[PDB]
Amino acid sequence: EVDYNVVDGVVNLTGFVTMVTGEGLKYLQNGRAQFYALIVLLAVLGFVIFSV
Amino acid sequence: AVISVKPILLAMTPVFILLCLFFGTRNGFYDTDQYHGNAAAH
Amino acid sequence: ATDFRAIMKFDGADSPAMIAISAVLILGFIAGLIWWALH
Amino acid sequence: GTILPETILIVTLLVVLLADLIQGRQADRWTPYFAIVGLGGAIATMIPLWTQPATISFFGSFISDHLSLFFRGLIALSALGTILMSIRYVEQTGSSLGEFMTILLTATVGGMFIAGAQELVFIFVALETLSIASYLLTGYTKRDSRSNEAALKYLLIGAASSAIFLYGSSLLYGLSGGHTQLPAIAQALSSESLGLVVALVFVIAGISFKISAVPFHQWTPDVYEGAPTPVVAFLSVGSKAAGFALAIRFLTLAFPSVTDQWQLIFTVLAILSMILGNVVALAQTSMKRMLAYSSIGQAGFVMIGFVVGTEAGYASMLFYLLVYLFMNLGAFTCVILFSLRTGTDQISEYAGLYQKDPLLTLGLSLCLLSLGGIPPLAGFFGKIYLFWAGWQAGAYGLVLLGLLTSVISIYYYIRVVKMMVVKEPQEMSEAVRNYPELRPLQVGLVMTVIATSLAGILANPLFNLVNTAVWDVPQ
Amino acid sequence: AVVSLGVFALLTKMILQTPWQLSSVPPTPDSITTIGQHFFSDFLLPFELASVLLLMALIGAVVLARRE
């Protein structure tokens, strides 16, 4: 049972994590052009702050 | 002294090939006597 | 789990607590031995 | 002066007019053929001026070194494949054909111009030809609401990004006195500054919209679902190749070869692109949406490709992009050939296809597998050469990260093969029960699959090609 | 607002920091003959190519707003 739970579950949890990450990151994509208008030019202007 | 595998292999492998092709024909259970399956394990 | 139903019928072995205090012993065993081995 | 570097472009331009005139007189003609003929004649005209003469400039507004030859031929092949696909796909819908190929060739001419340009005005005009043609083709089938919505959103976003690019180009004209060139621009200002960095970042914003990098990506998924499929097949390959040619020929040559912070910015964008596309395509059900996020991740692989400039990272980008052309066009040919017959639907409806149409299964399987980096297949060699180059320079996190995201992307690339192969006749979907079983599409699919399945081991003839191409870029 | 405002300040911080090259020479009045010369000396490709741009835009809008 240590093999099937404490060893197996730990690595299957890797698939679970990189699955739920995809399930929860798509909400960044929301179907709004104005949200792109935000995270296009505000997506940058951080890249100027740690630049000069 | 010491014995070498080279002539042993050269003498065995033709017999292996011939018997392999022969016993390929000899068959049974898998053909019709039973075994509706298809060699998949489901 | 539910698949292991044979003469292997120990009840208090599938609980998460017992699994935890078993994995503790096994991991500590291999760890004591890897420390014994390096040093 | 010196219209010889221009011949190809105007040659294609000629047929644009022709494919409208025959389409204005007859209204039902054989225009799908001889567009292939002129594109082949263009790619044939490329060889006499590849290396036999030396590099030359038109008037300083246009240079035709080997790099421009590469990108022009690449975009031409993309247009050719997209035509061969779209002939009987757009005819299946109640829409014309002449204006379609007119606009497609126009985008092609724009992207074949922008790969050899070194002047701000001409960069902008060619960029806008390609952009506006894409805005149209995204919405060419206005019977559906989603097509028109995608065309609207893509048009508005691209107009804003282009205006940002145009502001930055204005600044870069401002700074160094006059100079609207590019070799003279990064010639009178040669030091770090605030305004040079602002111009840099705005041009990055303008380019990332083209090459689909994140966070500049939000158009790709929605547009690739909504838009016509063969339009997307040209869009990804050609717009990316134009974008990367623009990136090199601007950032390296006209812009500056001094303020090399853009390398850091492309590392950031590539990291995010790998982590986003290959992870979020893993949670999808449609093919076109999946291919969109795939394309994002593949762009990330390329972006670590050319962030390490040592005369091999650039070459690796070029080869991997040549290879992604074949791979992605093959995948789109297969999804076209599936969506035509009966299906017209998403991933889950591919199940049980190996019994009905094995040819399509071979095609799409090999293409999807090559995209994930499977042995002998061209995408594998492209990815390992990217890793070789980007590791040679000293980027260690990027290589491990891209390897890992390829290992993640194999999952959703193999879901499709689980459907098409593993699923047994007890698990077919309703679409495949009644599957029946055009010519130019089949020959294109074969010409594509044999390439992506054989152009990985036959690689020296087209590594010599690329390393001959990339002597020219500064570094 | 804040995003937009930041950009303005950022741009302003450039506009007042960089040493522009004022180039004290009287400009030229004939700003139409010169553009004619530039359409056929320097910037000829954009002329010839904006031609087909306008063609393609007409072909597009004519077949995207058509009522059918």
Next chain:
Amino acid sequence: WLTTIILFPIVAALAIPFIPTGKGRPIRWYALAVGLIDFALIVYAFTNFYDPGMQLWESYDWIPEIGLRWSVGADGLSMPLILLTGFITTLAILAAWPVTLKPRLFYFLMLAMYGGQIAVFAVQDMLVFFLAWELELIPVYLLLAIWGGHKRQYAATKFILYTAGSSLFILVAGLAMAFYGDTVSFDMQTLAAKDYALGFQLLVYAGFLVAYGVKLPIVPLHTWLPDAHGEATAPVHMLLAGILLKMGGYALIRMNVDMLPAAHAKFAPVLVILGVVNIIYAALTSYAQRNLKRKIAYSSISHIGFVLIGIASFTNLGMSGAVLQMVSHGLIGASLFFLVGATYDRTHTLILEEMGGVGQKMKKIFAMFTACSLASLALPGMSGFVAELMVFIGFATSPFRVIVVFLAAVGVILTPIYLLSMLREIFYGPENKELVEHEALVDAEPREVFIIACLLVPIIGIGLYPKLLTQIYDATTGQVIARAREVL
């Protein structure tokens, strides 16, 4: 020769799609003829194989722009395993006669992973090594996911994921050793003759280890194995368990004892304690497991600990014990899993308590299975014991090596526990009632008996006079261990 050996099965496999049929019969004869001809090429190129180094290497140049060269090379350390794959994959094909479900794809993928298994040994370029290591993924994925098992979804997915994400540091490591200095080597020999600093020897080593310890599954890097070797038919399994684990062991030897010896000397105790952990862990998990196949998979996991110990020793004997164990288990586990597949085919059941006394009517598989089971454990007169004995002797002759021997010899007691309990549960006792009404399979058609007899002749010929298998690599292993002791 090696290039013909590798490309003829693959090239001849591309003919199968346009090859006549009425139901699916003439494919398997073609595949078997290809396998037999290629094995003949092995043993005929083994005549001109003198017995220290690469006794034949045929280099070429594909990509000079990187350093990629088609550098095939045989060796004392790699020729036994080439013979082994050429023999055992042929016998897998000679075991897969009843495959009716998609036989074209079967005998295409089987021939593809017949060059994908000889290549990993007959390759000396570190990029082509990665290529051949990688090209086992899709064929094995389809071999598991289409035919074989109910949990084959999770099994195949977990397989390809782990053997991709841990087929990951092999390339990174080959690179990391390729550009330490001013030469773009990409070659085993030229890259083993380089002076690597300890600061990254033991980092590139762990990079190799995360790869060579999942395919040669060590402590937790095994959980793919029960699922991928449980949900798998027999002839698939013969390859998956008889060659690929040996691929891991071979590459471990050749990339971590000729090429990072200074870190090997510092990490070897880890391999040793890991090996005895592997033995005891796998044996307990096998005696606990009840199904039928997962049991024998954990038995393989148990038997790999002798390899870990023999490589993590430093004398000239433990290495030979490791290689002998490898050639032994490749011959033993193959017959075991073949008989398990046959027993499932006759019973349509795996679970132990759900059947008993089947050896009253099905009394031909019982003898063959008893013999292979006696061969699993360290029985004398066979190669399974010579390996164990040589490992014990060579290691002790070198962690204060008196406790680890005491723990590794527990397997001597602990293997027959689950093996003989399995025999008792399956074949001994009174026949089941009508609960087993599957008509006990007509006892092993001669065609199965030939498979296991030809797997059971070499094992005894080894166990009686083991030098037959040790004449191959007394020179190469001698040079390797002389190097690895010259460092220390």
